[PDB]
């Protein structure tokens, strides 16, 4: 039986709300405030999800939180892209049921260019006819797609987990055609990284000037952004690509 897929379906988070007031006129401050609130809620869900993944708990405890925090942006971009595809056919960005970005919001959020890349990703789910199961497997693999260049505390086990998740993805594909499909999916996975990078830069810059634009940022998010994001931006932590960029 599809044991692995059963597990991924079983732990997949349900709907997560942003808590946005859609009765108020759109503003940079209100939109980013709601995105940050959504972020805090999504991080809680991602931690619970990751810890329930096959073999994840065998990683050193410190490596567990590190990989979750390094891969989070990518995971969220990919998941949001899928939500946009399944709910509004990639027409708009479905951050949450109560936070759907139309073109006006993409502009007002001052995150237009990033939104364009995220919507493009959403469109690929349609162009490549990505199945819900391929989505689940790829998303799980994204958790193991970005690490410190100098390695994790137990880098050896991480390598083993990543290998096994790649094998499961190849598995669903097999369940010349397979070769072409694996190529397409790994190319799609690689495309998430540059998008996450743009968002890492944006969120970092926003934190540094949050006091001037009235964003605030919840205490926990500010800590993660100030400690982990710069490691990525400075090159100490790098994404793992399938293909040479």
Ligand X SMILES: C[C@]12CCC(=O)C[C@@H]1CC[C@@H]1[C@@H]2CC[C@]2(CCOCc3cc(F)cc(F)c3)[C@@H](O)CC[C@@H]12
* 50 binds ligand X, rule: CB under 6 A: no
Largest CA distance in the chain: 55
Closest by CA position to 138, among listed 179, 86, 193, 93: 193
Q: Give the residue with the Cβ less far from ligand X, 43 or 192.
A: 43
CA distance 156 to 152: 8
Q: Please say whether the beta carbons of 77 and 118 come within 8 A.
A: yes
CA distance 218 to 210: 11
Angle at 80 between CA 77 and CA 83, to 5 degrees: 155
We find the least distance from the C-beta atom of residue 81 to ligand X, in angstroms, to be 9
* Closest residue to ligand X: CB criterion: 39
We find the least distance from the C-beta atom of residue 79 to ligand X, in angstroms, to be 7
* 225 binds ligand X, rule: CB under 6 A: yes
Q: Single out the residue of 35, 67, 141, 185 in contact with ligand X (rule: CB under 6 A).
A: 35
The footprint of ligand X on residues 153-212 (CB under 6 A) is: 199-200, 202-203, 206
Q: Give the residue with the Cβ less far from ligand X, 77 or 185.
A: 77
* 31 binds ligand X, rule: CB under 6 A: no
The footprint of ligand X on residues 55-94 (CB under 6 A) is: 69, 72-73, 76-77, 80
We find the least distance from the C-beta atom of residue 213 to ligand X, in angstroms, to be 11
- Tell me which residues touch ligand X (CB under 6 A): 32, 35-36, 38-39, 42-43, 69, 72-73, 76-77, 80, 95, 199-200, 202-203, 206, 221, 224-225, 228-229
């Amino acid at each position: 039986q599809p044991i692995f897929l059963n597990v991924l379906e079983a732990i997949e988070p349900g709907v997560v709300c942003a808590g946005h007031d859609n009765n108020q006129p759109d503003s940079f401050a209100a939109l980013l405030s709601s995105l940050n609130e959504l972020g805090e809620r999504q991080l809680v869900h991602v931690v619970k999800w990751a810890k329930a993944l096959p073999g994840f708990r065998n990683l050193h405890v410190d490596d567990q939180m590190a990989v979750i925090q390094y891969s989070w942006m990518g995971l969220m971009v990919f998941a949001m892209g899928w939500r946009s595809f399944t709910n509004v056919n990639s027409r708009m960005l479905y951050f949450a049921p109560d936070l759907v970005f139309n073109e006006y919001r993409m502009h007002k959020s001052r995150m237009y260019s990033q939104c364009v890349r995220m919507r493009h990703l959403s469109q690929e789910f349609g162009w490549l006819q990505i199945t819900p199961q391929e989505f689940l497997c790829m998303k799980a693999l994204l958790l193991f797609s970005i690490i410190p260049v100098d390695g994790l505390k137990n880098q050896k086990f991480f390598d083993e987990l990543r290998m096994n998740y790649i094998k499961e993805l190849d598995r669903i594909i097999a369940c010349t055609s397979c070769s072409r499909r694996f190529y397409q999916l790994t190319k799609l996975l690689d495309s998430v990284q540059p998008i996450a990078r743009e968002l890492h830069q944006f969120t970092f810059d926003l934190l540094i000037k949050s006091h001037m634009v009235s964003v605030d940022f919840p205490e926990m998010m500010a800590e993660i952004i100030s400690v982990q994001v710069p490691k990525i931006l400075s090159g100490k932590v790098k994404p793992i690509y399938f293909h040479t960029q």
